[PDB]
Enzyme design. Structure first.
Site, mmCIF file in Angstrom:
data_model
loop_
_atom_site.group_PDB
_atom_site.id
_atom_site.type_symbol
_atom_site.label_atom_id
_atom_site.label_comp_id
_atom_site.label_asym_id
_atom_site.label_seq_id
_atom_site.Cartn_x
_atom_site.Cartn_y
_atom_site.Cartn_z
ATOM 1 N N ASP A 1 0.788 -1.227 0.000
ATOM 2 C CA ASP A 1 0.000 0.000 0.000
ATOM 3 C C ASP A 1 0.818 1.273 0.000
ATOM 4 O OD1 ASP A 1 -2.149 1.765 0.246
ATOM 5 O OD2 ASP A 1 -2.577 1.219 2.353
ATOM 6 N N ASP B 1 -1.366 5.552 -5.586
ATOM 7 C CA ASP B 1 -1.800 4.676 -4.496
ATOM 8 C C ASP B 1 -2.108 3.260 -4.951
ATOM 9 O OD1 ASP B 1 -2.837 3.570 -2.161
ATOM 10 O OD2 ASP B 1 -4.644 4.854 -2.088
HETATM 11 C C1 LIG Z 1 -3.063 -0.175 8.026
HETATM 12 O O1 LIG Z 1 -2.821 1.139 8.545
HETATM 13 C C2 LIG Z 1 -3.377 2.172 7.889
HETATM 14 N N1 LIG Z 1 -4.014 1.949 6.755
HETATM 15 C C3 LIG Z 1 -4.574 3.011 6.149
HETATM 16 N N2 LIG Z 1 -5.156 2.788 4.942
HETATM 17 C C4 LIG Z 1 -6.123 3.693 4.317
HETATM 18 C C5 LIG Z 1 -6.993 2.736 3.481
HETATM 19 C C6 LIG Z 1 -7.531 3.423 2.241
HETATM 20 O O2 LIG Z 1 -8.582 4.039 2.275
HETATM 21 N N3 LIG Z 1 -6.750 3.377 1.101
HETATM 22 C C7 LIG Z 1 -7.235 4.109 -0.079
HETATM 23 C C8 LIG Z 1 -5.483 2.828 1.105
HETATM 24 N N4 LIG Z 1 -4.696 3.131 0.131
HETATM 25 N N5 LIG Z 1 -5.087 2.035 2.110
HETATM 26 C C9 LIG Z 1 -6.027 1.556 3.147
HETATM 27 C C10 LIG Z 1 -6.759 0.294 2.758
HETATM 28 C C11 LIG Z 1 -6.788 -0.277 1.524
HETATM 29 C C12 LIG Z 1 -7.609 -1.488 1.506
HETATM 30 C C13 LIG Z 1 -7.929 -2.249 0.265
HETATM 31 C C14 LIG Z 1 -8.938 -3.221 0.254
HETATM 32 C C15 LIG Z 1 -9.314 -3.832 -0.934
HETATM 33 C C16 LIG Z 1 -8.697 -3.484 -2.125
HETATM 34 C C17 LIG Z 1 -7.684 -2.521 -2.123
HETATM 35 C C18 LIG Z 1 -7.064 -2.119 -3.357
HETATM 36 N N6 LIG Z 1 -6.545 -1.788 -4.316
HETATM 37 C C19 LIG Z 1 -7.294 -1.917 -0.930
HETATM 38 C C20 LIG Z 1 -8.133 -1.752 2.756
HETATM 39 S S1 LIG Z 1 -7.698 -0.580 3.915
HETATM 40 C C21 LIG Z 1 -5.333 1.402 4.511
HETATM 41 N N7 LIG Z 1 -4.552 4.274 6.591
HETATM 42 C C22 LIG Z 1 -3.898 4.473 7.745
HETATM 43 C C23 LIG Z 1 -3.276 3.439 8.443
HETATM 44 F F1 LIG Z 1 -2.618 3.618 9.607
#
Ligand SMILES: COc1nc(N2C[C@H]3C(=O)N(C)C(=N)N[C@@]3(c3cc(-c4cccc(C#N)c4)cs3)C2)ncc1F
Length: 387
Positions: free
Chosen positions: A36, A232
């Site tokens: 991610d 992203d």
């Molecule tokens: C772990 O810790 C932290 N994770 C986060 N994140 C923010 C989330 C988010 O809204 N996006 C846009 C992101 N890029 N990542 C997060 C996630 C992505 C998926 C997910 C699920 C299914 C398919 C896909 C794809 N492609 C991605 C689940 S959570 C995690 N933020 C602060 C933290 F401390």
């Protein structure tokens, strides 16, 4: 050059994300971890959950260290709460190093772990500024670079199959590569073009022009980066600011006007199907995003095809898809739609992101994705949004 040990180390698909195998603890506990670039925490399932078949067991690791501090993440693509600690972490198909890293042990979650998905945690690869609870929690990649001789760079090749992968196929298929500490020349064709990382928090970039089949969307370029534009790997779609999305969809509808699609399709809710093999790719336009170059008054463009922005979904023998461009109120997000077309180099050492045509992008006999330049572009700093 060539990083054979890391080539083909990812699995997954745009709708469920792409993951890499990692190990945590002593003896090592293997987990599948979502890659991610849109977050900066390393967080793993650490308690039983109906959608997890394994989790991190801190009591079984001799090298576990409790930081005696909680961490809470609010609703985004789910929510979770956990406990901070450190442990020894490795990437089996990675650099041959083991590092002591921060780990958020997830103890409670809501709509975070997904039924049918194969990942048990997330590897946030962005910068400390957006780490939770705050920027004092060193992200994994910062630890890796500090503790080893691994160069401060990683590159991602996300490989969309171009067709739906069932439960067994998605587990057996190669989803791409994450090259830690380098660039593997086998993963792309043509030249790499670099855009500056505007600021080190998310991987923020500046878009300076947008075309739909060569036709300029002709918006004030600040609209394209309102309130930011980021790269992203943890977002499925290409997400555009409301006003940009409205202009882009109107232009994509006009270009594809020989076939009428329901409102639900353009909203990304409803699938569209065609008889096997008859998807009319040629009626859909290519989309080009021009990015600020490294040279003053110079830009370059990345061009994607409908084979990137129409996401294959199972319905029958028909070929079905969802429209994978959607609206955002938090800026542009260049998600898996963009990244599946390109090999993307996160050159943290030189504060820049590189794009090259991916050796695994899906195309047809008439069109291909492209990365081209240079173009003369004036006042590009004006395209960046402030406040
Ligand atoms: C772990 O810790 C932290 N994770 C986060 N994140 C923010 C989330 C988010 O809204 N996006 C846009 C992101 N890029 N990542 C997060 C996630 C992505 C998926 C997910 C699920 C299914 C398919 C896909 C794809 N492609 C991605 C689940 S959570 C995690 N933020 C602060 C933290 F401390």
């Amino acid at each position: 050059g060539s990083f054979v040990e890391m080539v083909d180390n990812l699995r997954g698909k745009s709708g469920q994300g792409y993951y890499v195998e990692m190990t945590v603890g002593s003896p090592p506990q293997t987990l599948n971890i979502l890659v991610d670039t849109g977050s900066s925490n390393f967080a793993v399932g650490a308690a039983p959950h109906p959608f997890l078949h394994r989790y991190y067991q801190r009591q079984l690791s001799s090298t576990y260290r409790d930081l005696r501090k909680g961490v809470y993440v609010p609703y985004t693509q789910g929510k979770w709460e956990g406990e901070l600690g450190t442990d020894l972490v490795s990437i089996p198909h990675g650099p041959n190093v083991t590092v002591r890293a921060n780990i958020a042990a997830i103890t409670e979650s809501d709509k975070f772990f997904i039924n049918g998905s194969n990942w048990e945690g997330i590897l946030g690869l962005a910068y400390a500024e957006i780490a939770r609870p705050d920027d004092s929690l060193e992200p994994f990649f910062d630890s890796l670079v500090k503790q080893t001789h691994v160069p401060n760079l990683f590159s991602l090749q996300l490989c969309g199959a171009g067709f739906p992968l069932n439960q067994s196929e998605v587990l057996a298929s190669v989803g791409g590569s994450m090259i830690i500490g380098g660039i593997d020349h086998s993963l792309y064709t043509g030249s790499l073009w670099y855009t500056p990382i505007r600021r080190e928090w998310y991987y923020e970039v500046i878009i300076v022009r947008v075309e739909i089949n060569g036709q300029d969307l002709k918006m004030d370029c600040k609209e394209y980066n309102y309130d930011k534009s980021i790269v992203d790997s943890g977002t499925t779609n290409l997400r555009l600011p409301k006003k940009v999305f409205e202009a882009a969809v109107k232009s994509i509808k006009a270009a594809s006007s020989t076939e009428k699609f329901p409102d639900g399709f353009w909203l990304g809710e409803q699938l569209v199907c065609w008889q096997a093999g008859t998807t009319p790719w040629n009626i859909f336009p290519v989309i080009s995003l021009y990015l600020m170059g490294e040279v003053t008054n110079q830009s370059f463009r990345i061009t994607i095809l409908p084979q990137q922005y129409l996401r294959p979904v199972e319905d029958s023998q028909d070929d079905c898809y969802k429209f994978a461009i959607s609206q955002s109120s938090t800026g542009t997000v260049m998600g898996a739609v963009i990244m599946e077309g390109f090999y993307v180099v996160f050159d943290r050492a030189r504060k820049r992101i590189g794009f090259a045509v991916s050796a695994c992008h899906v195309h047809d006999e008439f069109r291909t994705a492209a990365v081209e330049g240079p173009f003369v572009t004036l006042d590009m700093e004006d395209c960046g949004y402030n406040i």
